[PDB]
């Protein structure tokens, strides 16, 4: 039977993001996510301040 190897990562945490292959876009994937959650946080907080 043609046999294959299962791809996985050591000390696999679902809460942490996976092992990024490309270092040139790893930081933009981390930052285009962080930026979005921080933008949601600051907009939610300023509108709670306004109300």
């Amino acid at each position: 039977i043609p046999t294959h190897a299962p791809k996985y990562e050591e000390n696999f945490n679902p809460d942490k993001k996976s092992y990024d292959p490309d270092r040139t876009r790893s930081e933009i994937n981390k930052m285009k996510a962080q930026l979005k959650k921080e933008r949601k946080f600051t907009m939610k907080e300023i509108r709670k301040d306004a109300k």
């Binding site: 040139t24 930081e27 933009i28 930052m31 285009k32 962080q34 930026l35 921080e38 933008r39 946080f41 600051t42 907080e45 300023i46 301040d49």
Partner: peptide
């Protein structure tokens, strides 16, 4: 390869100034 990263870090620092002029514990 660098324009996206430095404008992203600059606007992130800008929104950090927006968070920093108010108190806004994050």
């Amino acid at each position: 390869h660098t324009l996206a990263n430095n404008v992203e870090s600059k606007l992130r620092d800008d929104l950090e100034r927006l968070k920093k002029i108010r108190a806004h514990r994050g």
